[PDB]
């Protein structure tokens, strides 16, 4: 029944380990710490309510404990057990939560050799993720370069195509007078103009189509890399968590 043996009493862990342990957990889950100030004395009760980790000081005085000046409770374990069955609203109506789900420290349910494998396995699994990410960023920006080139090829066609309209508009005045004059030489020169313009447009569009096909292939590879990263990442996180757990075990 001593506090050191309580499931929810973690000792002198940091506020960041508390945030890690309580992240996205259900409301009412809690753990009791030794105060951030190392000096022997008050504890801190950190419980999750409304998506936040509320911090409640446990004032120690004359051998008694409590959340307020009266300080009637005999021990921290007895205080928490009292509030494990009673809502905190009796102390502070600001929050109506109850101490429901203590974050047990007994969930731990050759070790050096095994830790070596996890350190190696995580290290190479990480290298996979960073390699993909740098390959992901490279393809992400390269896709942007090829996507703006398609925007540039679209404009170029707009100007070339606009020229066809001007040539169509103006060629009529020349074509009719030459036809009634019999000047086939200038007529065929204008036809050669048409031929040159159309050939250049065709070259432009062929390069644009090759660029579009290359862009589509690049985007498919980009999505493949993205899926690879999304598949690796959960295993990376799980491996890091297990490696840290084993390291903590060995450090005991």
């Amino acid at each position: 029944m001593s506090l050191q043996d309580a499931e929810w009493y973690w000792g002198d862990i940091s506020r960041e380990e508390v945030n890690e342990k309580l992240r996205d957990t259900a409301d009412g889950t809690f753990l009791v710490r030794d105060a951030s100030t190392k000096m022997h004395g008050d504890y801190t009760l950190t419980l999750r309510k409304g998506g936040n980790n509320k911090l409640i000081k446990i004032f120690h005085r004359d051998g008694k404990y409590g959340f307020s000046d009266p300080l009637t409770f005999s021990s921290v374990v007895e205080l928490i057990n009292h509030y494990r069955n009673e809502s905190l609203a009796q102390y502070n109506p600001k929050l109506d939560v109850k101490l429901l789900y203590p974050v047990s420290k007994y969930q731990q349910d050759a070790v050096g050799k095994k830790l070596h494998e996890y350190n190696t396995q995580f290290q190479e699994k990480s290298r996979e993720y960073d390699r993909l990410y740098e390959e992901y960023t490279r393809t992400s920006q390269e896709i942007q370069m090829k996507r703006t080139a398609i925007e540039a090829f679209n404009e170029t066609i707009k100007i070339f195509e606009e020229q066809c309209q001007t040539q169509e508009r103006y060629s009529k005045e020349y074509i009719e007078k030459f036809k009634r004059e019999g000047n086939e030489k200038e007529i065929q020169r204008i036809m050669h103009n048409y031929d040159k313009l159309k050939s250049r447009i065709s070259e432009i569009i062929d390069s644009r189509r090759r660029l579009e096909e290359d862009l589509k292939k690049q985007a498919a590879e980009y999505r493949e890399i993205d899926k690879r990263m999304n598949s690796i990442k959960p295993d990376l996180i799980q491996l890091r968590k297990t490696r840290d757990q084993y390291l903590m075990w060995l450090t005991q």
Binding site: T37, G50, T148, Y170, S171
Partner: protein, 981 residues
């Protein structure tokens, strides 16, 4: 080159690389005479060249004086049309587009009303600043382009004061007296508090005492030459144009601190007023509600569907959309998750219900959501990960609650972000397509819902106490505050006004998800006593998103923040522009007005916004800000363009060198480099422009015989320029900068900034610990410049001058400082080593080795490689990166090999302790600096968990005596038992 003539004719011209557009146009209209339609063409003066540039934006070439290769064409084709549009406006627009790196015409295409309102409303700031800079022309313009580089506090530190001879400083003044540049020295002793006018007067006294002028004649001469001349620093474009005490100018104070003699040139002010032109700013061409507090309903949001979700259906089990209403980093209510659905069909059509009531939604609330996946292994072994994220502001820039359906493109989760929601990230839809698009629907209440106009609706919904309030006041910003202290602070919210620096703590005691408490907090803030700028910057972090809190902070800054401190804290102040909900806010107006009235501020404002234009999250925000600035910076757009051209050419050269020349050896790489540099258009671009690191430094001709590629990682490019100033010999003739491509320099910049801050506070403390925060500037994506420290040698380069003995560094230092100067060299070495030990322990800088620890001939030590800090080694006890091997103690102990007996080492330890305590006393400033860099996207710190490191090295949770004991414990443990006493 194929040219599209206006009459439908198309002609191919054999143009050359360097041909200008006037020449090309004349040649084309000469060539067109071969073709049938030539008879219907007008004079070539009536048409201009149009084409498509590599940016993909059609460009009209009004500036026909440009060269062909300079056009940045997409394909070798030219279009000819009659000119349409305003000439000067279009050339200015293309200048701005080149400077900020994206076309200005893009911003005219975004249909977002917030953007179109921002870029039209910011022009008020630009016009106000432009009117300011012309109030006292031509002196005011000279103050704009050459702002005084003065300290904040006129009073000298007493240790600095004692350097002077009875309170008088000896100054040598130079006068150019002959057309052949005859130089005359006037060694002049003056009071350290004389303004430039009396220094001018004394210099004229010495200049004219020889003619034995009468008292009246002498007075008339002195008065005449007071209004004719100004003082300039010899060797750089730094001027003393304002009546500050001479010792307040950073140049003179650095001269006292270093013991040097100031060198000032007695320039005539007519030359100054002539060398700065009248460049002007002009207006660009583009220039049923119900109260939220009557809704009486709960907040709910529908998640319709998602697309383009990239997850292997075989690997993950199911996906869901996690959501939450956030105020800053504070959830206003418990997070809500959608039902898990197979990734084959991400469709939910589910109303998510939130505990928050609509009337109790704070103005700065935002919906944060993300798509997550479930790896459902054996129940409790289940693991979740985020696929993409995005944030939505509940209220838009015009105070309107979002309603109806909307589509949001989700950003990729930032590298290393394990959390399922990214509330610290920016709000807005991802501009990149082929990205997960999440469809949302917000409830509709029969009319648009506006946040109440609080101007009128704010009417609507013991000694131990003082000691406790003071104690909470002195606690650092990131200290944990329990619920009891939160209720006590709110209980005594009215008595907290007597201690104004309790506002940051009292704001975190508010129930931001409660209407009644927030109304009272707003009523308090408008009556709050202003607080110091070092504290008002804490209210600009992500933790304080309320427009009222941030408005109070911005008013405090604009009241008490000096231009010296503004330039000292510009990195952070531009980083916190990302945390603003809307484009048009008060912080942006403050920074823009300050940048448009001081070119020293504007230079780094531009280069800090420009350095993150590659980031798509902020690209639009910083691009609009940069366009607004560049439209109103006046003449400086020319020098900014020159610097941009130079950095672009260097970027291309290094990109080539590491993409195709990477495999080749050093000799041939240098051959390629020298071949490329000598070309005419690399010569023209890389010569004759202001230094990006320091706009006061001109970069003249290149010393190609000194430019080389170093052996450092990724082969940085080491340049070397002349100093074109006629007095360069007195400052330096060599301006050398290291151009790094492929190294992330925006954490090294922060490390050097913090070293500068802490050196400044130590000097003000009376501790003469010398730190060398050399210049550094990140100019793009992992590309930046690094100032080269003259006469510096890495400790490896000194050990190489041999097996080198332990005393090699001490022997070298003793040989470089023969005689009586030896003692000063050792003392400066000791002070620099102590300062850097303290700084690197506090900051957790990357590990230190001989190749990244420098040392000058002067004796000063300093560090160069600041790649990692705040101990990024967690992915593998806080460690001391800098250890004093015997090679350093032997120097500090003046050649006696004893490690922990000598007096000098004890005094060095005393310096270490006093410096550490001095930092620990100002820990709030450094915590505020780090906590304002969280949106910067550096891996080293993405959340307040990373800033918990400095709280540990500074030992803020312990007693000051216990913090001392902790520091000695760490030093002793790392240095093998020499620090226990």
């Amino acid at each position: 080159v194929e040219c599209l003539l206006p009459n439908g004719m198309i002609v191919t011209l054999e143009c050359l690389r360097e041909a200008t557009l006037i020449t090309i146009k004349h040649e084309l209209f000469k060539e067109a005479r071969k073709y049938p339609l030539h008879q219907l063409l007008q004079d070539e003066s009536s048409y201009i060249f149009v084409s498509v540039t590599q940016e993909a934006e059609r460009e009209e070439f009004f500036d026909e004086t440009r060269r062909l290769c300079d056009l940045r064409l997409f394909q070798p084709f030219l279009k000819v049309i009659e000119p349409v549009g305003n000439r000067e406006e279009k050339i200015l627009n293309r200048e701005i587009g080149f400077a900020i790196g994206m076309p200005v015409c893009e911003f005219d295409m975004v249909k977002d009303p917030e953007v179109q309102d921002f870029r039209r409303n910011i022009l008020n700031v630009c016009k106000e600043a432009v009117d300011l800079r012309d109030l006292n022309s031509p002196h005011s313009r000279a103050m704009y382009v050459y702002p005084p580089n003065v300290e904040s506090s006129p009073e000298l530190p007493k240790h600095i004061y004692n350097k002077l001879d009875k309170g008088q400083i000896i100054v040598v003044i130079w006068v150019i007296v002959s057309p052949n540049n005859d130089k005359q020295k006037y060694t002049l002793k003056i009071n350290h508090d004389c303004v430039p006018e009396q220094v001018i007067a004394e210099a004229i006294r010495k200049k004219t005492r020889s003619m034995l002028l009468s008292s009246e004649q002498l007075k008339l001469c002195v008065l005449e030459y007071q209004g004719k001349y100004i003082l300039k620093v010899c060797g750089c474009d730094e001027y003393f144009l304002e009546k500050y005490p001479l010792s307040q100018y950073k140049y003179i104070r650095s001269c006292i601190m270093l013991g040097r003699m100031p060198n000032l040139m007695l320039m005539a002010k007519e030359s100054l007023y002539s060398q700065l032109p009248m460049d002007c700013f002009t207006m660009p061409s583009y220039s049923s509600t119900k109260s939220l507090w009557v809704i009486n309903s709960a907040l709910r949001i529908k998640i319709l569907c998602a697309t383009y979700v990239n997850v292997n259906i075989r690997d993950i089990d199911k996906i869901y959309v996690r959501t939450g209403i956030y105020h800053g980093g504070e959830p206003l209510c418990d997070n809500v998750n959608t039902q898990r659905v197979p990734c084959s069909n991400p469709r939910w059509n589910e109303w998510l219900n939130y505990d928050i009531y609509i009337p109790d939604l704070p103005r700065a609330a935002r919906l944060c959501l993300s798509i997550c996946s479930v790896k459902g292994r054996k129940g409790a072994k289940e693991e979740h990960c985020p696929l993409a994220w995005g944030n939505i502001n509940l209220f838009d820039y015009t105070d309107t609650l979002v309603s109806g359906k909307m589509a949001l493109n989700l950003w990729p989760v930032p590298h290393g972000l394990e959390d399922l929601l990214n509330p610290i990230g920016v709000t807005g839809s991802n501009p990149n397509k082929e990205t997960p698009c999440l469809e949302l629907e917000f409830d509709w209440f029969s009319s648009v819902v506006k946040f109440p106009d609080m101007s009128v609706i704010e009417e609507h919904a013991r000694e131990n106490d003082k000691e406790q309030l003071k104690a909470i006041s002195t606690r650092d910003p990131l200290s944990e505050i329990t619920e009891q202290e939160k209720d006590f602070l709110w209980s005594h919210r009215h008595y907290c006004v007597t201690i104004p620096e309790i506002l940051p703590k009292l704001l975190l005691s508010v129930k931001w998800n409660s209407r009644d408490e927030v109304a009272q907090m707003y009523c308090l803030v408008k009556d709050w006593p202003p607080i110091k700028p070092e504290q008002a910057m804490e209210l600009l972090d992500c933790n304080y998103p309320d427009p009222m809190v941030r408005g109070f902070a911005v008013r405090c800054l604009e009241k008490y923040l000096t231009d010296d401190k503004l330039s000292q804290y510009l990195i952070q102040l531009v980083q916190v522009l990302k945390y603003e909900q809307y484009l048009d806010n008060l912080l942006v107006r403050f920074l823009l007005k300050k940048a448009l009235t001081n070119q020293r501020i504007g230079h780094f404002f531009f280069w800090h916004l420009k350095s993150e234009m590659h980031n798509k999250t902020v690209s639009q925000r910083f691009g609009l800000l940069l366009e607004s600035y560049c439209r109103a910076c006046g003449m400086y757009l020319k020098h900014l363009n020159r610097q941009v051209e130079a950095m672009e050419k260097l970027i291309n050269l290094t990109d080539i060198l590491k993409q195709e020349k990477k495999d080749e050896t050093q000799k041939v790489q240098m051959k390629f480099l020298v071949e490329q540099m000598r070309r005419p258009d690399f010569m023209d671009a890389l010569q004759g422009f202001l230094s990006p690191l320091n706009p006061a430094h001109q970069l003249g001709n290149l010393r190609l015989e000194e430019c080389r590629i170093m052996s450092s990682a990724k082969r940085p490019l080491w340049l070397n320029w002349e100093n074109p100033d006629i007095m360069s010999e007195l400052l330096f003739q060599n301006n050398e900068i290291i151009f790094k491509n492929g190294d992330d320099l925006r954490q090294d910049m922060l490390t050097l900034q913090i070293i500068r801050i802490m050196e400044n506070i130590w000097q003000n403390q009376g501790l003469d610990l010398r730190m060398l925060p050399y210049g550094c500037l990140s100019i793009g994506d992992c590309v930046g410049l690094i100032e080269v420290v003259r006469n510096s040698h890495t400790i490896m380069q000194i050990q190489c001058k041999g097996q080198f003995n332990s005393h090699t560094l001490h022997q070298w230092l003793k040989d470089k400082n023969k005689g009586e100067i030896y003692d000063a060299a050792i003392d400066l070495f000791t002070r620099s080593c102590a300062g850097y030990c303290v700084a690197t322990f506090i900051l957790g800088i990357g590990d230190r080795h001989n190749s990244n620890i420098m040392v000058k001939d002067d004796g000063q030590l300093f560090h160069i490689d600041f790649g990692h800090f705040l101990d990024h080694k967690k992915k593998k006890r806080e460690r001391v990166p800098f250890v004093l091997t015997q090679d350093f103690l032997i120097v500090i102990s003046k050649g006696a090999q004893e490690c922990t007996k000598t007096r000098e080492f004890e005094r060095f330890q005393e310096m270490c302790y006093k410096a550490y305590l001095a930092i620990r006393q100002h820990a709030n400033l450094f915590i505020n600096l780090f906590s304002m860099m969280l949106g910067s996207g550096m891996p080293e710190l993405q959340s307040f968990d990373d800033i918990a490191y400095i709280r540990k090295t500074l030992a803020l949770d312990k007693t000051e005596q216990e913090a001392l004991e902790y520091f000695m414990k760490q030093m002793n443990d790392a240095h093998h038992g020499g620090w226990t006493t």
